[PDB]
Design a protein around this ligand. Structure first.
Ligand SMILES: CC(C)CCC[C@@H](C)[C@H]1CC[C@H]2[C@@H]3CC=C4C[C@@H](O)CC[C@]4(C)[C@H]3CC[C@]12C
Ligand SMILES: CC(C)CCC[C@@H](C)[C@H]1CC[C@H]2[C@@H]3CC=C4C[C@@H](O)CC[C@]4(C)[C@H]3CC[C@]12C
Ligand SMILES: CC(C)CCC[C@@H](C)[C@H]1CC[C@H]2[C@@H]3CC=C4C[C@@H](O)CC[C@]4(C)[C@H]3CC[C@]12C
Ligand SMILES: CC(C)CCC[C@@H](C)[C@H]1CC[C@H]2[C@@H]3CC=C4C[C@@H](O)CC[C@]4(C)[C@H]3CC[C@]12C
Ligand SMILES: CCCCC[C@H](O)/C=C/[C@@H]1[C@@H](C/C=C\CCCC(=O)O)[C@H]2CO[C@@H]1C2
Lengths: 229, 54, 308, 338
């Protein structure tokens, strides 16, 4: 066309190549959204740090960016829409205290049924497992006073209790997991799944747990893409 | 004392002097009709006068 | 050239050379491919989803099968009726060279495309941590170009296209000359490699899926309908592709290589060989008919959607 | 104390409602029924600006009338020339989460904001080339939803903490603050005189704030959900508000009434953005249904429908010259309709 037009076209081509290279570089990582409460101990899990707080870690072959939102009111329905493409939502909930446990259940059911998060899977960390075991084994703060349905409920016969765990501890753990998974499955159409886990705040396997769960999520996404067509 | 601030704001808002709904509608209609001839979106301009042509 | 001696007998037209075979297979394949294309068009109208390279490959496959059937069956049925005649229509070696080119094109495209699709599925299953759709279309175009380039070889030498039994189709000759054996071996080798790669990749994918499923879920965390359906799809693909295409490739590779030459020096071909070739081409042709059924229609979601 | 204040507020609200009802001597529909409706409007894509690798969240035209800045989740502010399809600048972002972008009238400055809560102002006219952080505005307690350039030295920005702030670029300090919203301020529109601006929030209401005085001159309500976006009529006495109720309510300033409401049974999702034509006759509104609707501002009828994009249509805008309309969706593709 002309000299100015040629220069503009060359600049545009260089810019497009730069954007393509940056996208190729940045598409190999995974993004996760961290959620919970004040007492959930969100920052404790994944003991690595290599408004918005971003954490980076690198399991055997992949790198994860965990994004946490701070200084936000209860009206999460607005900014949550931003994270409609994250690979997973790491929902950390304190499993020791029972007074606020129902509030956590309500928060989880609100997150699960969100309009913009109908495809994002949830990795649930039932934190403070040691505190829960100590409280239940101490013969105090009965769960029945906060959960009438807990009574007359027994652990499934075809179950795998942790080695050395007392029957009461495993019973309480399974009750909590069952409540969360029931809320997960009642409204679930199979598009997204909830993965529960029991952390201890002194465990180094949380990163590997996230890695395995994200791998499974991606595999299921690929299988759905193949089959539905 | 947020109640006092709310009361003051309400009084200030009510201090306005509305003229007429019909007058506002007529003014809007007149403004729309005045510029009706300068609306390329409303009236498709000639292809020779359209910068996005190819 | 391009025409070889042959003459049908009385009983042959009634049982083996009857025209109902071509019409039946062509109509069934066309209807199945039309239904598959309708389903794919509906899915596309739903929206091009992420990692849609598989959708691109599937669309290319169904389109190739549909075009191949619609092109070849028309000529075959017309010749069966009495509209075309190799001794009267295009007597100057004009018409069925195109028929051989298109036949090779549409016989090679499905195999290579299936191999590519199997490779994509293997990558997406065994190694999840790996990734536009332009690349898929580029690959489809490259596959079609390779198939056509192989098909055009006899035009510039080596190969030879001739009208074969029952005098209704025109295909590569099973001669003992250097060019004939070279082209036959090349075609059979590429077909066998495509089938083998598809089978191997699908087997590895099915093994990985079985390891994932049989692997204890601990808490029954997942209903594995999706993994079971994929395993069934892959097993069907493997069995159908192999059992349908391998015999023809083996036959065309074996016929060219024989101590007593198959085709006599005068150009005559034994009736047994002609009948075997016709039967093997029919069983191979059924691959295209069953392809959309295995890939698309034999799906729980698609069957449920088409139920009402 | 509290009871007396509540009674006074109730009395003031009742008096305001009575005055509003009295001023409602007629309806715009009755006046406009005598106007011949505009025929069907059919607009086809002319430019398909592509290159963004993530979901586009904002857009804003420029005074040059062929210029628009787009921001996405990949963390890039891309300045496009509408006439051609050649990118002019591709500024990178410190934070990949950006929700608001704004183009200064002079074209020498641009503004960006998002979940980081810190607004970044970049100077396009670099003395030695390259674009970097020309200024950083901080002090808000929430994510920034919208921002506009009153001039080359003053910038108004609305945050999710239920507040708006006028900042001086040269001083980099909060020269003024506006408060009173009960919900997050998700919208903001500047009047032609750049003196009074109407802002909406999650409180399902809008408020008119005067820049010089910084007082809530008027407050309008009626929406049943949050107001996602707001546009100001060119004349200077009316505006339009789009909410999640699948309704678009056009109000008035002098009348102090909800002049009209646009809704249809077929449309059920919320409206992401609103815009006005050069004369204001046509109202543009993008919907979550992946479409855009052109309504007749004086007939309450869906004049036209623009179909495009494979994902949510988020940002909308109309060039000052009024020759084209830009729309950006989560498909990662802007588009220009004419
Ligand atoms: C149910 C679906 C899969 C069947 C599709 C292929 C069918 C239509 C094919 C396969 C076997 C075929 C038959 C096989 C043999 C004969 C004998 C003679 O009369 C010629 C035609 C006739 C009668 C064929 C008609 C077509 C046929 C019935
Ligand atoms: C996509 C599908 C339909 C395949 C289409 C391939 C077309 C282009 C092929 C099929 C048959 C081919 C022809 C077959 C034979 C000859 C005779 C030769 O002396 C010149 C080339 C010519 C005339 C070929 C031209 C290209 C041709 C028409
Ligand atoms: C200790 C060793 C044997 C364990 C590893 C093999 C385990 C996982 C077993 C269980 C299920 C098996 C698969 C089941 C089905 C098939 C399909 C068949 O056409 C090829 C073999 C293949 C693909 C099997 C390979 C081996 C397999 C994957
Ligand atoms: C999925 C597997 C089972 C393949 C599907 C079955 C196909 C290949 C079957 C169904 C009908 C069959 C044909 C039915 C009748 C005849 C006539 C006979 O004189 C030669 C074989 C021939 C021409 C058969 C070839 C194989 C055939 C086409
Ligand atoms: C190596 C060839 C691959 C072909 C794949 C293609 O997808 C199949 C086409 C078949 C054709 C085979 C040609 C001749 C077979 C004999 C026909 C006859 O004489 O009745 C026609 C009869 O079924 C259809 C149409």
């Amino acid at each position: 066309v002309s000299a100015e037009d040629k220069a503009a076209a060359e600049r545009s081509k260089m810019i497009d190549k730069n954007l393509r290279e940056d996208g190729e570089k940045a598409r190999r990582t995974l993004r996760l959204l961290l959620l919970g409460a004040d007492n959930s101990g969100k920052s404790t899990i994944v003991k690595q740090m290599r408004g918005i707080f971003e954490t980076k870690f690198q399991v055997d072959k992949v790198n994860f960016h965990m994004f946490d939102v701070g200084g936000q009111r209860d009206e999460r329905r607005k900014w949550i829409q931003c994270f409609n493409d994250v690979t997973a939502i790491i929902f950390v909930v304190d499993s020791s205290d029972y007074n606020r446990l129902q509030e956590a259940l309500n928060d989880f059911k609100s997150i699960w049924n969100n309009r913009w998060l109908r495809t994002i899977s949830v990795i649930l960390f039932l934190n403070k497992q040691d505190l829960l075991a100590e409280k239940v084994l101490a013969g105090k703060s009965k769960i029945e006073d906060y959960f009438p349905e807990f009574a007359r409920y027994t652990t499934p016969e075809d179950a795998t209790p942790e080695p050395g765990e007392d029957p009461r501890v495993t019973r309480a753990k399974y009750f909590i997991r069952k409540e969360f998974v029931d809320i997960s499955t009642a409204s679930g159409d199979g598009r997204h799944i909830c993965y529960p886990h029991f952390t201890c705040a002194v465990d180094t396997e949380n990163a590997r747990r996230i890695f395995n769960d994200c791998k499974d999520i991606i595999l299921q996404m690929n299988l759905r893409e193949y089959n539905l067509v | 004392a947020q109640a006092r601030k709310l009361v003051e704001q309400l009084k200030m808002e009510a201090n306005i002097d509305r003229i007429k709904v019909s007058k506002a509608a007529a003014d809007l209609m007149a403004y729309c009709e005045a510029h009706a001839k300068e609306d390329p979106l409303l009236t498709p301009v000639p292809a020779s006068e359209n910068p996005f042509r190819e | 050239p391009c025409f070889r001696p042959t003459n049908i007998t009385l009983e042959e037209r009634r049982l083996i050379a009857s025209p109902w075979f071509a019409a039946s297979f062509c109509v069934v394949g066309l209807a199945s491919n039309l239904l598959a294309l309708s389903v794919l068009a509906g899915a596309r109208q739903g929206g091009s989803h992420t990692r849609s390279s598989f959708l691109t490959f599937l669309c290319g496959l169904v389109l190739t099968d549909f075009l191949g059937l619609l092109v070849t069956g028309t000529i075959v049925v017309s010749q069966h009726a009495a509209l075309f005649e190799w001794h009267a229509v295009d007597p100057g070696c004009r018409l069925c060279r195109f028929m051989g080119v298109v036949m090779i094109f549409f016989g090679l495209s499905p195999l290579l495309l299936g191999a590519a699709m199997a490779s994509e599925r293997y990558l997406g299953i065994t190694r999840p941590f790996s990734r536009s759709q332009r690349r898929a279309w580029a690959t489809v175009g490259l596959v079609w170009a390779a198939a056509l380039a192989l098909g055009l070889l006899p035009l510039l030498g080596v190969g030879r296209y001739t009208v074969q039994y029952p005098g209704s189709w025109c295909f590569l000759t099973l001669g003992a000359e250097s060019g004939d054996v070279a082209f036959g071996l090349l075609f059979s080798m590429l077909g066998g490699l495509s089938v083998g790669l598809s089978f191997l990749l699908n087997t590895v994918s099915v093994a990985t899926l079985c390891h994932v499923y049989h692997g204890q879920e601990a808490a029954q965390q997942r209903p594995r309908d999706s993994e079971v359906e994929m395993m069934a799809q892959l097993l069907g693909i493997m069995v159908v592709a192999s059992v349908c295409w391998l015999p023809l490739l083996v036959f065309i590779a074996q016929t060219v290589l024989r101590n007593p030459p198959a085709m006599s020096p005068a150009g005559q071909l034994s009736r047994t060989t002609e009948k075997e070739l016709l039967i093997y081409l029919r069983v191979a042709t059924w691959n295209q008919i069953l392809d959309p059924w295995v890939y698309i229609l034999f799906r729980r979601a698609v069957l449920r959607r088409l139920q009402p | 104390e509290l009871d007396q204040l509540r009674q006074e507020a109730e009395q003031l609200k009742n008096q305001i409602r009575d005055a509003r009802k009295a001023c409602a001597d007629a309806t715009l529909s009755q006046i406009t029924n005598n106007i011949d409706p505009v025929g069907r409007i059919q607009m086809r894509t002319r430019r398909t600006l592509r290159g963004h690798l993530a979901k586009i969240y904002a857009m804003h035209w420029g005074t040059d009338s062929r210029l628009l800045v787009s921001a996405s989740q990949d963390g890039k502010l891309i300045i496009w020339d509408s006439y051609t399809t050649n990118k002019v600048h591709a500024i990178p972002l410190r934070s990949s989460w950006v929700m608001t972008c704004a183009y200064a009238p002079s074209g020498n400055y641009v503004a960006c904001g998002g979940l980081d809560n810190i607004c970044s102002i970049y100077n396009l006219k670099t003395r030695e080339g390259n674009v970097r952080v020309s200024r950083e505005l901080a002090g808000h307690t929430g994510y920034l939803s919208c921002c506009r350039f009153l001039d080359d030295n003053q910038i108004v920005t609305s945050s999710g903490d239920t507040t708006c702030a006028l900042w001086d670029i040269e001083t980099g300090q909060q020269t003024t603050t506006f408060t009173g919203h009960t919900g997050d301020v998700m919208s903001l529109s500047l009047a032609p005189d750049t003196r009074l601006f109407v802002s909406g929030a999650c409180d399902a209401s809008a408020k008119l704030w005067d820049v010089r005085e910084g007082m809530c001159r008027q407050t309008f309500t009626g929406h049943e959900s949050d107001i996602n976006a707001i546009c100001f009529f060119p004349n200077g006495n009316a505006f339009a508000t789009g909410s999640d109720d699948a309704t678009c309510r056009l109000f008035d300033l002098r009348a102090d009434q909800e002049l009209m409401t646009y809704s249809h049974d077929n449309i059920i999702c919320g409206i992401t953005s609103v815009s006005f034509s050069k004369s204001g006759r046509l109202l543009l509104a993008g919907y979550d249904d992946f479409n855009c609707n052109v309504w007749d501002a004086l007939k309450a009828d869906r004049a036209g429908v623009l179909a495009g994009h494979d994902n949510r249509v988020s940002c909308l805008g109309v060039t000052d010259d009024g020759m084209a309309v830009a729309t950006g969706s989560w498909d990662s593709f802007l588009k220009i309709w004419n």
